[PDB]
Amino acid sequence: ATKFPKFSQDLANDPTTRRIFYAIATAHDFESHDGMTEENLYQRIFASHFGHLAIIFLWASGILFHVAWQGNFEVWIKDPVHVRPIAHAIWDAQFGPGAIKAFTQAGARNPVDICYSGVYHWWYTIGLRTNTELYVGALFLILLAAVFLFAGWLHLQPRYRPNLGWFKNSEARLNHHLAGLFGVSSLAWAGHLVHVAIPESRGQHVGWDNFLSTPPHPAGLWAFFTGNWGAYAQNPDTAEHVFSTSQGAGTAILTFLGGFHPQTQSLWLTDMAHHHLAIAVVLIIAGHMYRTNWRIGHSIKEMMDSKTFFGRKVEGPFNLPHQGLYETVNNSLHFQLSLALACLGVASSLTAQHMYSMPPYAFIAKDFTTMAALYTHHQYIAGFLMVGAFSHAAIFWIKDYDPEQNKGNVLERVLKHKEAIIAHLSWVSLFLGFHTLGLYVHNDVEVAFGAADKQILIEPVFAQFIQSANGKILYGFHTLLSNPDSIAFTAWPNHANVWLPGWLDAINNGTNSLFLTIGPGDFYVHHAIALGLHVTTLILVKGALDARGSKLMPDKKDFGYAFPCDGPGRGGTCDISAWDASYLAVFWMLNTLGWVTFYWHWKHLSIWQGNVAQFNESSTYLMGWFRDYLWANSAQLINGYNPYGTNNLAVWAWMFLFGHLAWAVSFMFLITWRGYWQELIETLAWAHEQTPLSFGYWRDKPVALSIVQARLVGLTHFTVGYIATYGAFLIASTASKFG
Amino acid sequence: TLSGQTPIFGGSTGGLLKKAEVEEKYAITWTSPKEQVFEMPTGGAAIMRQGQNLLYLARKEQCIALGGQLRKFKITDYKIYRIYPNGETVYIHPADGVFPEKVNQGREKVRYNDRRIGQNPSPSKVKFSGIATYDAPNS
Amino acid sequence: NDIIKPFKGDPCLGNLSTPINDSPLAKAFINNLPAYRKGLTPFMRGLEIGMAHGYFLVGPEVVIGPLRESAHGANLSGLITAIYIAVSACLGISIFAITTFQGNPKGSYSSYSKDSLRPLRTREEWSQLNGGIFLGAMGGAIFAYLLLENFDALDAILRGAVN
């Protein structure tokens, strides 16, 4: 009976090595710790978010401190296209002379790392020009992290620790988060853009000792309150304006040209300030929707139980029974966590899908490796958030769901036909894999036997209609913003498409990624992607809806979320838990984003190298994906160190091979299972006891690690090997052809 | 207590380890009418004696693995003891002197639920309570 | 209520329970220093105390000593200072042990003393302490001497200059 772990008693009395491991993996499941009340649960959720916010701020201050200290922001900012950003310095005391010389790069006088995060472009756009501005930002974020470490400690003191009623005050939190956390913050950000970022992109230096005196507009503070709002967009930046200088600059601070800045190939800063200003007002308005304590507002609980639609008998919102859902969502933390992750998983996919097509930061479209890494980062982040959104759906069904409160509501109607949903995800998955693999390997066979004209090539004429419906005149659909005489193009009653000449100038220019040209090769991958999103939804939906149990074991709710099996009886129940559907869907999530990011990378690697006709003519069959993408672009990655030398890709060539090993060692935890290793550890335990001079002896008996743990240990290696291998590929295959 | 002659066995590697004399240890005691050979639960083969046999095993599963082997020699008079390191010897199998397949009087329904397994309560009912859904004093 | 209590609950004791002497962090640090760590022979108490001191005591003489001007001679002057300070210190605790442990130590080393801030009350415990303090402060002095006289060779290998 050890002290550790103190949160669970029955794991502290574990005599084996699984209690050190299970303590790590249970240490944050506060709702299952011994002697926990609901009141104490939230007060530890709350106080560990402060400890999390501080880590984000200490991480962010580490970005700033290291480019202030060891970066080349001053050198970079004078030529953001031809010099590489420095991440930090290298101190590996076991480099040879070949690695010092190779990694002494980008105008540095010491080994350094090339920043592929884009923070240089982000800071250059938001108005940071000196290293000292970066340093005081780093110091401020350290102290801002301090006031959240203190606040977290503060709200565990009994006199400051909030009560359960404060946490379950859903209407008051939504009102402030909409109005203040998002509304005021985006209003404040438009304040920075108007006061600092926009003026400093026109040359004038605005700082903390300067900003109180110089107004951002000549008509400041008076055109707003009179109502003469148009004064803020009188003369905008011209098309010959060059960034961070006064030549070509205007005076408009809130103007809505749309499209791209012709010199940075990014969105206009004045167009962003006007954006967050509009978003703020919409968000602040949205934050006055729910009544807090002023009996003017909405009550979410009553918006559920309402059954009267202007006197007409209805069953609830949208004529669907939502009664009891307020007390279901409000008391469930996993329902709330599932919704939050699902909404960050969309906001992070949406981040990736928009920041490549519509680059926000200056000169980021000309930094291909940064642009490529940022997409792959946020899509992989979004894939994990989507898996966790459906993980906590499965926890929600098991632990904090009851049929009594939710009797007859919209949530209980889903369980009534959970097999109709799963059977249909099964059909779509089967449909999309038979006719995408079958169409790829038909194209393989025809190209293999020379008859490349016998490929089945389906033009994606529906997405090409979208592009034509947004402005792309390339295809010739000639409708609806491709038709200059249409109702939508002109907006006949008002003609207020001030955004349209600038946008159509950008969408119809072929040198950007905004609405890329789409061909038959793009058709097939969007069905691989659709097949991917459907199977990994099928695995997760099956795991959430069968978390309560199915005919193979109808009592899964009693066994918890993560259990191995229910023995070999009834045929065998390996991987039966709802946890094993989250485990099984990480493979499909990684696979699917290994199709999204492979397709994003190869499509852009063909545009960037000018060989666009390589992707269009060879992405329709699977060998082209294998010869023209993987085999072709590995050449300079694997030659990062050869017998004849070593270059700046020697670390990417090493992590590429590192991730192959981390991937392969995953198969050990995934293929060979527990009882093999226990009979082998039982033998090594015999050898240690019987041998002389071995004076150590285990405090806790060595056992082969458990069933649900190896599935997690092997899933971590598969993931780390999936990310180190592709991270090294994507960085080295893009930052070797180019700068 | 316990006593008996140990079977003819050349000693194995699968036998007792340091857990035997430190945590606790088991002993199976049976009587055989014949001098035949049985399979050792710790690997190998040993010749069981003519009178009272005594064998020391590390865990209870081995003893009942061996006990199930003795029933194939038509021997059902074996007794399994549990030797704590301080030295006292408990009788644990068969606990009442008759084999557990048989039904006695005086044994009690222990860990019996008076409901179908289907109507165990949902985990939300026992939320933030000491009990689990399967003890559940309702029904 | 108040954070400053009477010392272990006895108001008549001449001390206070304060965040510096009676804190969960401060008690955990002091009571695991080698002077107070539970489970150490007095030799390992002194050995770990000695090496911490012999190590740092060669410093203040090799860079602001009289020999600091040269390189090979500076390290000798710093080592012997740690040799002399420790030998005279270990002379001090051999004669401390002789003169306090003489039948009924007048003070905190009496049999009925119940003092936690000095738990070595035996003269079987103060003799292994002397050996540990000595051999520790000698090895620490030599290790800090070897690391300093080889500083150019050590500066290269923590800079990768040796490939």
Place this chain on the structure above:
Amino acid sequence: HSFAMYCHNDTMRAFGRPQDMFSDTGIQLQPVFAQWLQHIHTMTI
């Protein structure tokens, strides 16, 4: 002593230290007992 020496070599060649890798030019590991048999099997003719 077989695979992890491949990860030693993989790391010295990446560092740019080919003279401290298990090469024919770095730290040689010669098959002494197999080059001996190759000598035995050709002098017996």
Place this chain on the structure above:
Amino acid sequence: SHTVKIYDTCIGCTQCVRACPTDVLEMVPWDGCRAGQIASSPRTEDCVGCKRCETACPTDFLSIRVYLGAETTRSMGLAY
């Protein structure tokens, strides 16, 4: 320290007791069966967790559940 609960759906088929490798189960007299028996689990600290008792129970959605709980030195079967 597992938890082998027995439910009222037993038929006294006695098969669960025979499959147990560690003698956790035994029969007690009862009245809800033609057999007049029901399984009981008096020795569950000895339960190793093999669920071999659950494979032998013939009642559909079986009457005996092993509930794998706090695992100790004799519920994991360690000879060392």
Place this chain on the structure above:
Amino acid sequence: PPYTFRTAWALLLLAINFIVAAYYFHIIE
């Protein structure tokens, strides 16, 4: 029973779908 709320919300979404196809097939402007 005749479905009156499932219908007229399915036929409403087909309507929006058929309008989109109307611009797609170059029928209405």
Place this chain on the structure above:
Amino acid sequence: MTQLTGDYAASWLPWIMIPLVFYILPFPVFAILFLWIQKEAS
């Protein structure tokens, strides 16, 4: 170049802290963190 240097200010500081946090401090840290996970609850 043939050495690890630093053009940045306080370039002596990686010289000592890369050994500190990576192969001098962790074994004390893994010992302290070991004494915490294996203490009797008496």
Place this chain on the structure above:
Amino acid sequence: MSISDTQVYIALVVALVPGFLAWRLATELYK
């Protein structure tokens, strides 16, 4: 113009403030 020699040490002692405030909070959450 990179940051000065002293500015690195100023950040070192400033970052020691959240270094101890993390101890404040980690132990208050009862490690």
Place this chain on the structure above:
Amino acid sequence: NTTLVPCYKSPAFVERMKNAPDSYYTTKPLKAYSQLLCGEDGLPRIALDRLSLAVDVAIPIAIFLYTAGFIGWSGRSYLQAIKKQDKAEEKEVFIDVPLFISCMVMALFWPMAVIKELLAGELVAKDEEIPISVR
């Protein structure tokens, strides 16, 4: 879409005709690809324009969906043909080929068979006929 032009007028596709052996495969089929909407790379493609191809994006779909239902209907109707015989346990491992053939000739006119399955309320089993799980 207007980027696609017939292989009649396509410079990248007459080049396909020029350097083409015959042997059986690149003349008789390749003449028939001249009527297809052909990209800017000399590759026949499947576009969805209007009535121009409204019959050609119905010949494969009508031929498949009929014979997919034909396989499905004969396979389905043979299953109920042996469930009623109370011999379906071994009637499936040993295919009763005269019964299966007679279930195929019922499946020639399967589109009109499914309608009177549906209109009789007999195609689809009612919801509390079907074994399900606890839910």
